[PDB]
Amino acid sequence: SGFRKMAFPSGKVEGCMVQVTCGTTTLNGLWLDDVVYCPRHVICTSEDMLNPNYEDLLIRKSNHNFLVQAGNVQLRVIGHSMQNCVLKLKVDTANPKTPKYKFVRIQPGQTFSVLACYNGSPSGVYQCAMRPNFTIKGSFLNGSCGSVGFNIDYDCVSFCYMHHMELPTGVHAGTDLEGNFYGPFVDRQTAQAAGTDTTITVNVLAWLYAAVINGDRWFLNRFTTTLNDFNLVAMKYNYEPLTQDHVDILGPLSAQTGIAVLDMCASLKELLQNGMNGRTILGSALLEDEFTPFDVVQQC
Amino acid sequence: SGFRKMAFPSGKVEGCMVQVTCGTTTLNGLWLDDVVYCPRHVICTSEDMLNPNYEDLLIRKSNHNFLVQAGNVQLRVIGHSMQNCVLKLKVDTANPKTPKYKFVRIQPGQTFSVLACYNGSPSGVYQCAMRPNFTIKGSFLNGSCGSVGFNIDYDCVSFCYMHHMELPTGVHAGTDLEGNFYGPFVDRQTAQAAGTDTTITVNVLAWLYAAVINGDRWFLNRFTTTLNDFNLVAMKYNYEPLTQDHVDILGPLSAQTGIAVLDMCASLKELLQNGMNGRTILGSALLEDEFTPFDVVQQC
Ligand code: NA
């Protein structure tokens, strides 16, 4: 019993974290086999970040200008290449601690664990979601760039996020491990405004299912609804539209609890209309959207 | 920027988790050097847990009745002893992955990271606090007993919690690593009622300091208070009494923000009296008490 924001055990990723220094920028890199992956902005000065020509800046750099440190031990960089917004630094030593891994590009609303690092060293772990506007609400200070987000599925680490930027609003942007940004964001210190941060409706429903599992039932009402009638409500509360694909994904939690998905949708509509009246649900005073259906099943 | 419930990296503890089976109870043990620590209720059947005589039950057990598995590899138990509510199983092999460690008995209101395990295998990590009634609000299913709570301080793992029990109310009880329960709880399946779950006032203040650091300032008022006047308020809201030791611990966060501790106390009094009016603070609709002053400084 009980229900926590639960991250994957971080040990497999800790063994992959290194320090990358270029000139006088230090950040974190990910060492898998004989490649170190890091944000390409490692090559930029402060002034460069205002308006960087990455191809031009990369002309000035050779293999020996990339200082890679794994603990207290120096890796020899034997090649480098830019792939979208990441650098790949070929090193002469394969990481002996390399886990089984893949690179995956997640969808908006998918969750992951972050291992926030500074100077190549693990600081801490927490859960995140890919917001529908393609930002995350991380905890990242100066030096945390190159910290990664991941899921562990079947003892295989699926890397989904590398940290690049903090927006002026203090939310976070980054790439997949092919170096493609999530959303419209660029690795430039310029005005970048996030769009509407909508609520991940399918996740809220999963968490309501989690609450019923755990004995928090007060919010279950006597109504049902339709996907269209629900969605007219969802849209006025900046909730994402629910699809029949969402309903299908909730089926196992429906089966477990005996609560039809549309019934749970009607309960959520009443919570949106009437609020929570100073009550809580799984110890939250608001509707939590950073648990996926799969996250709930895994935890329960 | 941003502020998360942040756990320590779990890798150092993952390397210590083993499976312990006695008869047909399986749970988790902690392998440090040549000792495995686990809950003594490993020796109990279901029926035994109603009213166990641990000394008598232990008469029936020899070293070979304790099956200890580290991954896919069997440890030889060469001695065993009961220390309060834990068993210590001496094994013939020192754990090669043993970190620098200590055993510490924390105070009520102190926080820690939990690595929830099943069958000796890491499942996930989250933060907890030792409630003032000496329960924790974990996430623990059947098989999770022996999962540990810890802090990492200076690359030394300080073990503070081993999981033993779920109360009928679905909160959790356990021991330190000397096997002494936190609070009045016993390793018996009997009616055990927790006392009043009060709020950890010093922690709330730390989190208000965290919010100011991160730019969430709306709740700062124009008042001050006194420790006595504050505490008359705290007591009616089942908040723990604030002491001058608490004020002293908040000094660094006071210094950073320029907000005198008693001023922040007055802000909290208004939040207790008037509530939050549907607003949030560091994305919580309620006052969060599971960050210590030290936790905030570490994260910021
Ligand atoms: Na909340």
Coordinates of C-alpha atoms and ligand atoms in Angstrom, one line a residue:
Chain A
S1 CA 0.0 0.0 0.0
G2 CA 0.9 3.7 -0.5
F3 CA 1.8 5.4 -3.7
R4 CA 5.0 7.4 -4.4
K5 CA 6.6 9.3 -7.2
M6 CA 9.0 6.4 -7.9
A7 CA 12.1 6.6 -10.1
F8 CA 14.1 3.7 -11.6
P9 CA 17.2 2.5 -9.6
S10 CA 19.9 4.8 -11.0
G11 CA 23.0 2.5 -10.7
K12 CA 23.2 1.4 -14.3
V13 CA 23.2 5.1 -15.4
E14 CA 25.6 6.3 -12.7
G15 CA 28.2 4.0 -14.3
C16 CA 27.8 5.9 -17.6
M17 CA 28.3 9.4 -16.3
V18 CA 31.5 11.3 -17.3
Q19 CA 32.8 14.9 -17.2
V20 CA 33.4 16.7 -20.5
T21 CA 35.4 19.9 -20.7
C22 CA 36.0 21.9 -23.8
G23 CA 37.9 25.1 -23.4
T24 CA 36.4 26.2 -20.1
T25 CA 32.8 24.9 -20.3
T26 CA 32.4 21.7 -18.2
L27 CA 29.3 19.6 -18.4
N28 CA 28.2 15.9 -18.3
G29 CA 28.5 13.2 -20.9
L30 CA 27.1 9.7 -21.3
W31 CA 29.7 7.0 -21.9
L32 CA 28.2 3.9 -23.7
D33 CA 30.6 1.5 -25.4
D34 CA 33.4 3.7 -27.0
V35 CA 31.3 6.9 -27.5
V36 CA 30.6 9.8 -25.1
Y37 CA 27.5 11.7 -25.9
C38 CA 27.2 15.3 -24.7
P39 CA 25.4 18.6 -25.7
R40 CA 27.2 20.3 -28.6
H41 CA 27.1 23.6 -26.6
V42 CA 30.1 22.3 -24.7
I43 CA 32.1 24.1 -27.5
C44 CA 30.4 27.5 -26.8
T45 CA 31.6 30.3 -24.6
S46 CA 29.0 32.5 -22.8
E47 CA 29.2 35.0 -25.7
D48 CA 28.9 32.2 -28.3
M49 CA 25.5 31.1 -26.8
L50 CA 23.8 34.3 -27.9
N51 CA 24.1 33.3 -31.6
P52 CA 26.3 30.2 -32.1
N53 CA 27.4 28.9 -35.6
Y54 CA 28.1 25.3 -34.4
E55 CA 29.7 24.2 -37.7
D56 CA 32.0 27.1 -37.6
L57 CA 32.8 26.8 -33.9
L58 CA 33.5 23.0 -34.5
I59 CA 36.2 23.9 -37.1
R60 CA 38.4 25.3 -34.3
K61 CA 38.2 22.1 -32.2
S62 CA 40.3 18.9 -32.5
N63 CA 40.1 15.6 -30.6
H64 CA 42.6 16.8 -27.9
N65 CA 40.4 19.9 -27.0
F66 CA 37.8 17.5 -25.6
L67 CA 38.8 16.6 -22.0
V68 CA 36.8 13.5 -20.9
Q69 CA 37.1 12.3 -17.3
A70 CA 35.6 9.1 -15.8
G71 CA 36.0 9.5 -12.1
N72 CA 39.7 10.3 -11.5
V73 CA 40.8 8.8 -14.9
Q74 CA 41.2 10.4 -18.3
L75 CA 39.7 9.0 -21.6
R76 CA 41.5 9.4 -24.9
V77 CA 39.2 11.0 -27.5
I78 CA 40.1 9.5 -30.9
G79 CA 37.3 11.0 -33.0
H80 CA 34.4 13.5 -32.8
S81 CA 31.3 14.3 -34.8
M82 CA 28.2 16.4 -34.4
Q83 CA 24.8 14.6 -34.8
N84 CA 22.0 17.3 -34.6
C85 CA 22.5 19.0 -31.2
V86 CA 24.8 16.3 -29.6
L87 CA 28.5 15.6 -29.9
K88 CA 29.7 12.0 -30.2
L89 CA 33.3 11.7 -28.9
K90 CA 34.8 8.4 -29.9
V91 CA 37.2 7.3 -27.1
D92 CA 39.8 4.5 -27.2
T93 CA 38.2 2.5 -24.3
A94 CA 34.7 0.9 -24.2
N95 CA 32.9 1.6 -21.0
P96 CA 33.2 -1.6 -18.9
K97 CA 30.0 -0.6 -17.0
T98 CA 27.9 -0.2 -20.2
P99 CA 24.4 -1.6 -19.6
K100 CA 22.1 -3.0 -22.2
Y101 CA 20.6 0.2 -23.7
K102 CA 18.6 1.8 -26.5
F103 CA 17.8 5.3 -27.5
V104 CA 14.1 6.1 -27.7
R105 CA 12.2 9.3 -28.6
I106 CA 9.3 9.5 -26.2
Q107 CA 5.8 11.0 -26.8
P108 CA 4.4 14.0 -24.9
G109 CA 3.0 12.7 -21.6
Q110 CA 5.5 9.9 -21.2
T111 CA 7.4 9.9 -17.9
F112 CA 11.1 9.2 -17.1
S113 CA 13.7 9.2 -14.3
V114 CA 16.4 12.0 -14.4
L115 CA 19.8 11.5 -12.8
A116 CA 20.9 15.1 -12.2
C117 CA 24.7 15.3 -12.4
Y118 CA 27.4 18.0 -11.9
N119 CA 31.1 17.6 -13.1
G120 CA 30.3 14.1 -14.2
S121 CA 29.2 13.0 -10.7
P122 CA 25.6 11.8 -9.8
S123 CA 23.8 14.3 -7.6
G124 CA 20.3 12.9 -7.4
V125 CA 17.3 11.2 -9.0
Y126 CA 13.7 12.2 -9.6
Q127 CA 10.7 11.6 -11.9
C128 CA 9.8 13.9 -14.8
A129 CA 7.2 14.0 -17.6
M130 CA 7.5 15.3 -21.1
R131 CA 5.0 18.1 -21.0
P132 CA 2.5 18.4 -23.9
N133 CA 4.4 21.7 -24.8
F134 CA 7.7 19.6 -25.0
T135 CA 9.3 21.2 -21.8
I136 CA 10.1 19.3 -18.6
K137 CA 9.9 20.7 -15.0
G138 CA 13.3 19.5 -13.8
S139 CA 15.6 20.5 -11.0
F140 CA 18.8 21.7 -12.9
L141 CA 21.5 24.1 -11.8
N142 CA 24.6 25.4 -13.7
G143 CA 26.7 22.4 -14.7
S144 CA 23.8 19.9 -15.0
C145 CA 23.7 19.9 -18.9
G146 CA 24.2 16.5 -20.4
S147 CA 22.3 14.8 -17.4
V148 CA 20.0 12.2 -18.9
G149 CA 16.4 10.9 -18.5
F150 CA 15.7 7.2 -18.9
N151 CA 13.3 4.3 -18.3
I152 CA 14.4 0.7 -17.3
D153 CA 12.3 -1.9 -19.1
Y154 CA 13.4 -5.5 -18.9
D155 CA 16.9 -4.7 -17.5
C156 CA 17.6 -2.6 -20.7
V157 CA 18.1 1.2 -20.1
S158 CA 16.1 3.2 -22.6
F159 CA 17.6 6.7 -22.8
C160 CA 15.0 9.3 -23.8
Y161 CA 16.4 12.8 -22.7
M162 CA 19.6 14.8 -22.5
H163 CA 19.4 18.1 -20.7
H164 CA 20.5 21.2 -22.8
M165 CA 18.7 24.4 -21.7
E166 CA 16.7 26.3 -19.1
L167 CA 14.1 28.7 -20.6
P168 CA 13.7 32.2 -19.0
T169 CA 10.5 30.9 -17.3
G170 CA 12.7 28.3 -15.6
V171 CA 11.3 25.2 -17.3
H172 CA 13.7 22.9 -19.1
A173 CA 14.4 21.8 -22.7
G174 CA 16.6 19.1 -24.2
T175 CA 17.0 16.4 -26.9
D176 CA 16.7 12.7 -27.4
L177 CA 20.0 10.8 -27.6
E178 CA 20.1 11.5 -31.4
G179 CA 20.4 15.2 -30.5
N180 CA 16.9 16.2 -31.8
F181 CA 15.2 18.7 -29.5
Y182 CA 11.8 17.9 -28.1
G183 CA 9.5 20.7 -29.3
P184 CA 10.6 23.8 -31.2
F185 CA 13.5 24.7 -28.9
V186 CA 17.1 25.5 -30.1
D187 CA 20.5 25.5 -28.3
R188 CA 20.7 29.3 -28.4
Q189 CA 20.3 31.8 -25.6
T190 CA 17.4 33.6 -27.1
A191 CA 13.7 34.3 -26.2
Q192 CA 12.0 30.9 -26.4
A193 CA 8.5 30.9 -25.1
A194 CA 6.7 27.6 -24.3
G195 CA 3.1 27.1 -25.4
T196 CA 0.3 26.1 -23.2
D197 CA 1.2 23.6 -20.6
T198 CA -1.9 21.4 -20.8
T199 CA -2.7 18.5 -18.4
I200 CA -2.0 14.9 -19.4
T201 CA -5.6 13.5 -19.0
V202 CA -4.7 9.8 -19.5
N203 CA -2.1 10.2 -16.7
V204 CA -4.6 11.8 -14.3
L205 CA -7.0 8.9 -14.9
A206 CA -4.2 6.4 -14.2
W207 CA -3.5 8.2 -10.9
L208 CA -7.2 8.1 -10.0
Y209 CA -7.1 4.3 -10.7
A210 CA -4.0 4.2 -8.4
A211 CA -5.9 6.0 -5.7
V212 CA -8.9 3.5 -5.8
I213 CA -6.3 0.7 -5.6
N214 CA -4.9 2.3 -2.5
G215 CA -8.3 2.9 -0.8
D216 CA -8.8 6.6 -1.7
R217 CA -12.4 6.4 -3.1
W218 CA -14.3 9.6 -1.9
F219 CA -14.2 11.2 -5.4
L220 CA -16.0 8.2 -7.1
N221 CA -19.4 9.7 -8.2
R222 CA -22.7 8.1 -9.5
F223 CA -22.3 9.5 -13.1
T224 CA -21.0 8.4 -16.4
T225 CA -20.0 10.4 -19.5
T226 CA -19.1 10.1 -23.1
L227 CA -15.6 10.7 -24.7
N228 CA -17.2 13.7 -26.6
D229 CA -18.9 15.2 -23.5
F230 CA -15.8 14.6 -21.4
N231 CA -13.6 16.2 -24.0
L232 CA -15.8 19.4 -24.1
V233 CA -15.0 19.7 -20.4
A234 CA -11.3 18.7 -20.9
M235 CA -10.7 21.4 -23.5
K236 CA -12.1 24.2 -21.2
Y237 CA -9.7 23.1 -18.4
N238 CA -6.6 22.8 -20.8
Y239 CA -6.7 19.1 -20.4
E240 CA -5.4 17.0 -23.4
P241 CA -8.2 15.3 -25.5
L242 CA -8.8 11.7 -24.5
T243 CA -8.8 9.2 -27.4
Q244 CA -10.0 5.6 -27.7
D245 CA -6.2 4.7 -27.7
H246 CA -6.1 6.2 -24.2
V247 CA -9.2 4.2 -23.1
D248 CA -7.6 1.0 -24.4
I249 CA -4.4 1.7 -22.4
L250 CA -6.5 2.2 -19.2
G251 CA -8.2 -1.2 -19.7
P252 CA -6.1 -3.2 -17.3
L253 CA -6.6 -0.6 -14.5
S254 CA -10.3 -0.7 -15.4
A255 CA -10.4 -4.5 -15.2
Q256 CA -8.5 -4.5 -11.8
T257 CA -10.9 -1.9 -10.1
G258 CA -14.1 -2.8 -11.9
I259 CA -14.5 0.9 -12.7
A260 CA -15.4 1.6 -16.4
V261 CA -13.1 4.2 -17.9
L262 CA -16.0 6.5 -18.8
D263 CA -17.2 6.3 -15.2
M264 CA -13.8 7.4 -14.0
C265 CA -14.0 10.2 -16.7
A266 CA -17.2 11.4 -15.1
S267 CA -15.5 11.4 -11.7
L268 CA -12.7 13.5 -13.1
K269 CA -15.2 16.0 -14.8
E270 CA -16.8 16.6 -11.3
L271 CA -13.3 17.1 -9.8
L272 CA -12.6 19.7 -12.6
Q273 CA -16.0 21.4 -12.1
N274 CA -16.2 21.4 -8.2
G275 CA -12.5 21.2 -7.3
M276 CA -11.3 19.1 -4.3
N277 CA -13.0 21.1 -1.4
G278 CA -9.8 21.0 0.7
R279 CA -9.6 17.2 0.5
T280 CA -6.6 15.2 -0.9
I281 CA -6.1 12.2 -3.1
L282 CA -3.0 10.0 -2.5
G283 CA -1.8 12.9 -0.4
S284 CA -2.1 15.5 -3.2
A285 CA -4.3 18.6 -3.1
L286 CA -4.3 18.7 -7.0
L287 CA -4.8 16.2 -9.8
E288 CA -1.4 14.6 -10.5
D289 CA -0.5 14.0 -14.2
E290 CA 3.1 12.6 -14.0
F291 CA 2.1 8.9 -13.7
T292 CA 1.5 7.0 -16.9
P293 CA -0.9 4.0 -16.9
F294 CA 2.2 1.8 -17.2
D295 CA 3.9 3.6 -14.3
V296 CA 0.8 2.8 -12.1
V297 CA 0.7 -0.9 -13.0
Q298 CA 4.5 -1.2 -12.4
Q299 CA 4.2 0.4 -9.0
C300 CA 1.0 -1.5 -7.9
Chain B
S1 CA 15.9 26.4 -11.2
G2 CA 13.0 24.1 -10.3
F3 CA 12.5 22.0 -7.2
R4 CA 11.9 18.2 -7.1
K5 CA 11.5 15.5 -4.5
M6 CA 15.1 14.3 -5.0
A7 CA 16.5 10.9 -3.9
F8 CA 20.2 10.0 -3.6
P9 CA 21.6 8.0 -6.5
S10 CA 20.8 4.3 -5.5
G11 CA 23.7 2.4 -7.1
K12 CA 25.8 2.0 -3.9
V13 CA 22.8 0.4 -2.2
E14 CA 21.7 -1.7 -5.2
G15 CA 25.0 -3.5 -4.9
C16 CA 24.1 -4.5 -1.3
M17 CA 20.7 -6.0 -1.9
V18 CA 20.2 -9.8 -1.6
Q19 CA 17.4 -12.3 -1.3
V20 CA 16.8 -14.1 2.0
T21 CA 14.5 -17.1 2.2
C22 CA 13.8 -19.0 5.4
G23 CA 11.3 -21.9 5.0
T24 CA 9.0 -20.3 2.6
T25 CA 9.2 -16.6 3.6
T26 CA 11.3 -14.7 1.0
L27 CA 12.3 -11.0 1.7
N28 CA 15.3 -8.7 1.2
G29 CA 18.6 -8.5 3.0
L30 CA 21.4 -6.0 3.1
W31 CA 24.9 -7.5 2.5
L32 CA 27.7 -5.3 3.9
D33 CA 31.1 -6.9 4.4
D34 CA 30.5 -10.6 5.5
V35 CA 27.1 -9.9 7.2
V36 CA 23.5 -10.0 5.7
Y37 CA 21.0 -7.9 7.7
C38 CA 17.3 -8.8 7.4
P39 CA 14.1 -8.6 9.4
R40 CA 13.9 -11.4 12.0
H41 CA 10.3 -12.1 10.8
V42 CA 11.9 -14.0 7.9
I43 CA 11.6 -17.0 10.3
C44 CA 7.8 -16.7 10.8
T45 CA 5.0 -18.3 8.9
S46 CA 1.7 -16.4 8.5
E47 CA 0.3 -18.1 11.6
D48 CA 3.5 -17.3 13.5
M49 CA 3.1 -13.5 12.9
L50 CA -0.1 -13.4 15.0
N51 CA 1.9 -14.0 18.2
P52 CA 5.6 -14.9 17.5
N53 CA 8.1 -16.1 20.2
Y54 CA 11.2 -15.2 18.2
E55 CA 13.7 -16.8 20.6
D56 CA 11.7 -20.1 20.4
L57 CA 11.2 -19.9 16.6
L58 CA 15.0 -19.3 16.3
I59 CA 15.8 -22.6 18.2
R60 CA 14.4 -24.5 15.2
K61 CA 16.7 -22.7 12.6
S62 CA 20.3 -23.6 11.7
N63 CA 22.7 -21.7 9.4
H64 CA 21.7 -24.0 6.4
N65 CA 17.9 -23.0 6.7
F66 CA 18.9 -19.4 5.7
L67 CA 19.0 -19.3 1.8
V68 CA 20.9 -16.1 0.7
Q69 CA 21.0 -15.3 -3.0
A70 CA 23.1 -12.4 -4.5
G71 CA 21.8 -12.2 -8.1
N72 CA 22.0 -15.8 -9.5
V73 CA 24.7 -16.9 -6.9
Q74 CA 24.3 -18.5 -3.5
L75 CA 26.1 -17.2 -0.3
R76 CA 27.2 -19.7 2.4
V77 CA 25.7 -18.7 5.8
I78 CA 28.3 -19.6 8.5
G79 CA 26.7 -18.0 11.5
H80 CA 23.5 -16.2 12.6
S81 CA 22.4 -14.1 15.6
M82 CA 19.4 -11.9 16.5
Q83 CA 20.0 -8.3 17.4
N84 CA 16.7 -6.7 18.5
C85 CA 14.3 -7.2 15.5
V86 CA 17.0 -7.9 12.9
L87 CA 18.9 -11.1 12.0
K88 CA 22.6 -10.9 11.2
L89 CA 23.6 -13.8 8.9
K90 CA 27.4 -14.2 8.8
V91 CA 28.4 -15.4 5.3
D92 CA 31.8 -16.7 4.1
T93 CA 32.2 -13.9 1.4
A94 CA 32.6 -10.2 2.0
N95 CA 30.5 -8.2 -0.4
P96 CA 33.0 -6.9 -3.0
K97 CA 30.5 -4.0 -3.7
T98 CA 30.4 -2.9 0.0
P99 CA 30.4 1.0 0.1
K100 CA 31.7 3.1 2.9
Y101 CA 28.7 3.0 5.4
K102 CA 27.4 3.7 8.8
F103 CA 24.3 2.9 10.7
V104 CA 22.4 5.9 12.0
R105 CA 19.2 6.3 14.0
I106 CA 17.5 9.4 12.7
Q107 CA 15.2 11.8 14.5
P108 CA 11.5 12.4 13.7
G109 CA 11.3 14.8 10.7
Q110 CA 14.5 13.6 9.1
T111 CA 14.2 12.5 5.4
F112 CA 15.8 9.6 3.5
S113 CA 15.7 7.8 0.2
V114 CA 14.1 4.3 0.0
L115 CA 15.2 1.6 -2.5
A116 CA 12.1 -0.6 -2.6
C117 CA 13.2 -4.2 -3.5
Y118 CA 11.4 -7.5 -4.2
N119 CA 13.2 -10.9 -4.2
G120 CA 16.5 -9.1 -3.6
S121 CA 16.1 -7.0 -6.8
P122 CA 15.8 -3.1 -6.9
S123 CA 12.4 -2.0 -8.0
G124 CA 12.5 1.8 -7.5
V125 CA 13.6 4.8 -5.4
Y126 CA 11.7 7.6 -3.7
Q127 CA 12.0 10.0 -0.8
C128 CA 10.4 9.4 2.7
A129 CA 10.3 11.2 6.0
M130 CA 10.3 9.8 9.5
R131 CA 6.9 11.1 10.6
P132 CA 6.6 12.6 14.2
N133 CA 4.5 9.5 15.1
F134 CA 7.4 7.3 13.9
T135 CA 5.6 5.9 10.8
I136 CA 6.7 6.5 7.2
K137 CA 4.4 6.8 4.1
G138 CA 6.2 4.4 1.9
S139 CA 5.2 2.4 -1.2
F140 CA 5.6 -1.2 -0.2
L141 CA 3.9 -4.4 -1.5
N142 CA 4.3 -8.0 -0.3
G143 CA 7.9 -9.1 -0.6
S144 CA 9.4 -5.5 0.1
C145 CA 10.4 -6.2 3.8
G146 CA 14.1 -5.6 4.4
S147 CA 14.2 -2.7 1.8
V148 CA 16.3 0.1 3.3
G149 CA 16.3 3.8 3.7
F150 CA 19.5 5.8 3.5
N151 CA 21.2 9.1 3.1
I152 CA 24.5 9.7 1.2
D153 CA 26.8 12.2 2.9
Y154 CA 30.3 12.6 1.8
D155 CA 30.3 9.3 -0.4
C156 CA 29.5 7.4 2.8
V157 CA 26.1 5.6 2.9
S158 CA 24.3 6.2 6.2
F159 CA 21.7 3.5 6.6
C160 CA 18.7 4.6 8.7
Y161 CA 15.7 2.4 8.0
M162 CA 14.8 -1.2 7.3
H163 CA 11.2 -2.0 6.3
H164 CA 9.3 -4.5 8.6
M165 CA 5.6 -3.9 8.6
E166 CA 2.5 -2.3 7.2
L167 CA -0.1 -1.1 9.8
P168 CA -3.8 -1.7 9.1
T169 CA -4.1 2.1 8.1
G170 CA -1.5 1.3 5.4
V171 CA 1.4 3.4 6.8
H172 CA 4.7 1.8 7.4
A173 CA 6.9 0.8 10.3
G174 CA 10.5 -0.4 10.6
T175 CA 13.8 -0.4 12.5
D176 CA 17.2 1.2 12.4
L177 CA 20.0 -1.2 11.3
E178 CA 20.5 -2.3 14.9
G179 CA 16.9 -3.7 14.7
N180 CA 15.3 -1.2 17.1
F181 CA 11.8 -0.1 15.9
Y182 CA 11.1 3.6 15.3
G183 CA 8.2 4.4 17.7
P184 CA 6.3 1.9 19.8
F185 CA 5.7 -0.6 17.0
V186 CA 6.4 -4.4 17.3
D187 CA 7.0 -7.2 14.6
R188 CA 3.7 -8.8 15.4
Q189 CA 0.5 -8.8 13.3
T190 CA -1.6 -7.1 15.9
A191 CA -3.7 -3.9 16.3
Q192 CA -1.1 -1.1 16.3
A193 CA -2.5 2.4 16.0
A194 CA -0.4 5.3 15.1
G195 CA -0.7 8.5 17.1
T196 CA -1.2 12.0 15.6
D197 CA 0.6 12.6 12.4
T198 CA 1.7 16.2 13.0
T199 CA 3.3 18.4 10.4
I200 CA 7.2 19.0 10.5
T201 CA 7.2 22.7 10.9
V202 CA 10.9 23.3 10.3
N203 CA 10.7 21.3 7.1
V204 CA 7.7 23.4 5.8
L205 CA 9.8 26.5 6.5
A206 CA 12.7 25.1 4.6
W207 CA 10.4 24.4 1.6
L208 CA 9.1 28.0 1.8
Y209 CA 12.7 29.1 1.6
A210 CA 13.2 26.8 -1.4
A211 CA 10.2 28.4 -3.0
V212 CA 11.5 32.0 -2.6
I213 CA 14.9 30.8 -4.0
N214 CA 13.0 29.5 -7.1
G215 CA 10.9 32.6 -7.6
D216 CA 7.6 31.6 -5.9
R217 CA 7.1 34.6 -3.6
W218 CA 3.3 35.4 -3.6
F219 CA 2.8 34.1 0.0
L220 CA 5.4 36.5 1.5
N221 CA 3.4 38.9 3.8
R222 CA 4.1 42.1 5.6
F223 CA 4.0 40.6 9.2
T224 CA 6.4 39.1 11.7
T225 CA 5.6 36.9 14.7
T226 CA 7.3 35.5 17.8
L227 CA 8.2 31.8 18.5
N228 CA 5.5 31.7 21.2
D229 CA 2.8 33.4 19.1
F230 CA 3.7 31.2 16.1
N231 CA 3.6 28.1 18.3
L232 CA 0.1 28.8 19.6
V233 CA -0.9 28.7 16.0
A234 CA 1.3 25.7 15.2
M235 CA -0.3 23.6 18.0
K236 CA -3.9 24.2 16.8
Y237 CA -2.9 23.1 13.3
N238 CA -1.1 19.9 14.6
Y239 CA 2.2 21.4 13.6
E240 CA 5.3 20.4 15.6
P241 CA 6.6 23.2 18.0
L242 CA 9.4 25.3 16.5
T243 CA 12.5 25.6 18.8
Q244 CA 15.5 28.0 18.7
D245 CA 17.4 24.9 17.5
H246 CA 15.1 24.9 14.4
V247 CA 15.6 28.7 13.9
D248 CA 19.4 28.2 14.0
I249 CA 19.2 25.3 11.4
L250 CA 17.3 27.7 9.1
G251 CA 19.9 30.5 9.4
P252 CA 21.7 29.7 6.1
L253 CA 18.5 29.8 4.1
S254 CA 17.6 33.0 6.0
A255 CA 21.0 34.5 5.1
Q256 CA 20.6 33.5 1.4
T257 CA 17.1 35.0 1.0
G258 CA 17.3 37.9 3.4
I259 CA 14.1 36.7 5.0
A260 CA 14.3 36.6 8.8
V261 CA 13.0 33.2 10.1
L262 CA 10.3 34.9 12.2
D263 CA 9.1 36.7 9.1
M264 CA 8.8 33.4 7.3
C265 CA 7.0 32.1 10.4
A266 CA 4.4 34.9 10.0
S267 CA 3.9 34.0 6.3
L268 CA 3.3 30.3 7.3
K269 CA 0.8 31.4 10.0
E270 CA -1.2 33.3 7.3
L271 CA -1.1 30.3 5.1
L272 CA -2.4 28.1 7.9
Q273 CA -5.2 30.6 8.8
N274 CA -6.3 31.5 5.2
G275 CA -5.2 28.4 3.2
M276 CA -3.8 28.7 -0.3
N277 CA -6.9 30.1 -2.2
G278 CA -6.5 27.7 -5.1
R279 CA -2.8 28.8 -5.7
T280 CA 0.3 26.6 -5.6
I281 CA 3.8 26.8 -4.2
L282 CA 6.6 24.9 -6.1
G283 CA 3.7 23.2 -7.9
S284 CA 2.1 21.9 -4.6
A285 CA -1.4 22.8 -3.5
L286 CA -0.5 22.0 0.1
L287 CA 2.4 22.8 2.5
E288 CA 5.1 20.2 1.9
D289 CA 7.0 18.9 5.0
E290 CA 9.3 16.1 3.6
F291 CA 12.3 18.5 2.8
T292 CA 14.7 19.2 5.6
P293 CA 16.7 22.5 5.7
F294 CA 19.8 20.4 4.7
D295 CA 17.8 18.8 1.9
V296 CA 17.0 22.3 0.4
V297 CA 20.6 23.5 0.6
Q298 CA 21.8 20.3 -1.0
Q299 CA 19.4 20.7 -3.9
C300 CA 19.8 24.5 -4.4
Ligands
NA1 NA -0.4 18.9 -3.8

